[PDB]
Design a protein around this ligand. Structure first.
Ligand SMILES: OC[C@H]1O[C@@](CO)(O[C@H]2O[C@H](CO)[C@@H](O)[C@H](O)[C@H]2O)[C@@H](O)[C@@H]1O
Ligand code: NA
Length: 288
């Protein structure tokens, strides 16, 4: 019942819910148990990169892939900052060794800026792709100047962005991304718990929302779906979004995310109501 979407123009067909950001823990047996359940739910997209400062243990994920690697789409990212070709090419070797596999499906640049050596970076990814060490590459960025450079100059297939009802800054860039045949991978779709059952911490805001505005918005949003489901479905209602990496701290939370993603898509009345009710901010920094 887990649907898939094409990632950009690539041959990667990713589950609409992806898995990432878990302390799979200290015990291998239980980590493998968690992974078996993730895959049983029809999730086929595993991103080992840190999201909100938690990644996936590559040694454990490697052991979970045993016997089924061909059916899983594996993503990773690229201490001493060294922005060279040689660094990008050497970093992926480490992940491959830990993962006990010989290719990565999607290799993603984190920490990019417009002052980086952009041709060198693109060349490193293209050389890895031509050699088959990776199948495709992408970036993780909320900087429009970085995004525009890689859309114009490279063959990225994906951009990972923080995106939710409460952070609609990405939407400005969706037409440009889609015109280039690129997809968005979403992080933070539940706004780190602000679009769930957890209390809004008193007095605290979120981006350009004050506390009182978060309270009013929770209450004014449609109530015929749980808020968590409305949040995930709002992200998915945009064709540019290929997959959402929602946070989880347990198998029960993964199962809740799966149930929400497999719910009925938003209609027009629903998506429009949300667009009108929620702020539509833009990025202030790194625009050009
Ligand atoms: O204030 C003008 C205009 O800005 C919006 C943008 O969403 O609200 C921002 O400004 C308010 C007044 O300073 C803040 O209370 C609010 O937190 C902030 O987002 C609009 O709501 C408002 O019309
Ligand atoms: Na614009």
């Amino acid at each position: 019942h887990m649907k898939k979407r094409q990632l950009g123009t690539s041959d990667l067909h990713v589950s609409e819910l992806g898995f990432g950001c878990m302390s799979l823990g200290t015990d291998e047996t239980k980590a493998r148990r968690i992974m078996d359940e993730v895959l049983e739910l029809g999730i086929n997209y595993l991103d080992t990169a840190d999201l909100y400062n938690q990644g996936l243990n590559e040694q454990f994920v490697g052991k979970a892939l045993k016997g089924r690697r061909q059916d899983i789409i594996l993503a990773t990212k690229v201490w001493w900052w060294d922005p060279s070709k040689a660094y990008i090419k050497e970093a992926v070797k480490d992940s491959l060794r830990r993962l006990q596999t010989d290719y990565i499906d999607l290799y993603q640049l984190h920490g990019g800026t417009i002052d980086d050596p952009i041709d060198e970076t693109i060349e490193a990814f293209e050389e890895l792709k031509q050699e088959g060490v990776i199948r495709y590459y992408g970036i993780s960025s909320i900087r429009p100047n970085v995004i525009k450079e890689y859309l114009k100059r490279s063959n990225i297939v994906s951009i990972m962005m923080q995106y939710s009802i409460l952070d609609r800054r990405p939407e400005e860039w969706f037409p440009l991304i889609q015109e280039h045949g690129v997809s968005v991978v979403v992080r933070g779709p539940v706004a780190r718990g602000l679009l769930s059952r957890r209390p809004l911490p008193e007095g605290e805001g979120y981006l350009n929302y004050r506390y009182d505005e978060l309270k009013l918005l929770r209450e004014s949003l449609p109530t015929d779906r749980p808020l968590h489901e409305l949040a995930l479905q709002y992200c998915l209602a945009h064709d540019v979004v290929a997959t959402v990496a929602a946070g989880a701290s347990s198998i029960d939370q993964v199962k809740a995310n799966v149930q929400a993603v497999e719910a009925t898509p938003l209609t027009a009345e629903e998506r429009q109501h949300i667009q009108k009710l929620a702020k539509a901010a833009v990025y202030e920094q790194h625009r050009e």
